[PDB]
Amino acid sequence: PVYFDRGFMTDLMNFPEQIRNIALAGHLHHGKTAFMDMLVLETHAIQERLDKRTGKKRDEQLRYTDVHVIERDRGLSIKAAPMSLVLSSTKGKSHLFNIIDTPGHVDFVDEVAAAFRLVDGVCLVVDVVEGVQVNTEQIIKHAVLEDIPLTLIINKMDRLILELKIPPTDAYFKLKHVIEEVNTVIENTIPGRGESKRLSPEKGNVLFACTSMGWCFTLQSFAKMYSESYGGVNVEEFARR
């Protein structure tokens, strides 16, 4: 059971402008299958079954897009995994998202290559603790050499708060370091036009997320929270500042 209508999803397939084809790509264990789990638990009615689990399996991560027995045993994705979800924007309009979840181990970059061939954009999931790692660099290089548009997902902000236990100012500096490291790989791949492909939160192509707790925000959406709470703020100017 899902929380939308599959006939409505087919009609959204019929209209080809309100559709986005994206691939979740990144390093090993940086939270791509967990991001897909966030979206799946938002769209699907499976929480009561996950609640009926008991013991250590009740502690187990969902990992909806890992279905191969190697994936369930080894605990990492080895195949690309597509889903088609009817997700909603801040204005409430339903869109169609065709998302391919890719592996993050440095051996299944063939799966990453096939998904990158199919998709129109790449959401790059980067752990805020480990930052830019080897497959992050590889995926960045391949994406910007194939000229695929790139957005950034900074994941594991709970690791910022609860593992490292750094104060909020140092958390800002950690986030700034990770974003500038991603942009540094962009620039070192295309010199002179990485600024044309610059990733930064004030532009709105950086998303801060915690996928184990199922939340994400942009600065524009957080300023929209301020707008809906206190009333009458100019959201784009507030996020820019």
């Binding site: 929380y3 009609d11 209209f15």
Partner: protein
Amino acid sequence: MTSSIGIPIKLLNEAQGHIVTLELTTGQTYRGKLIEAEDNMNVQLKDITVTARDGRVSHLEQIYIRGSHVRFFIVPDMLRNAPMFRSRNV
């Protein structure tokens, strides 16, 4: 109190991007792609076919329409089949 939004208003929000046909208090029917609709039902359109009640048929681009001066809108059956008509019990 926290302000909720009406179902026809959010239906306009979901109808943004499609070919909507609306008509207005001067008896004027406009057709085209909606690009933004707000809570006070102010809309814009971009590929407008105009039929004015004086018999005036025309075509132009990028009009702004006031929600006080609009009479009604027409949207497709997939927007009938939209997810918000499934009442999620909370």
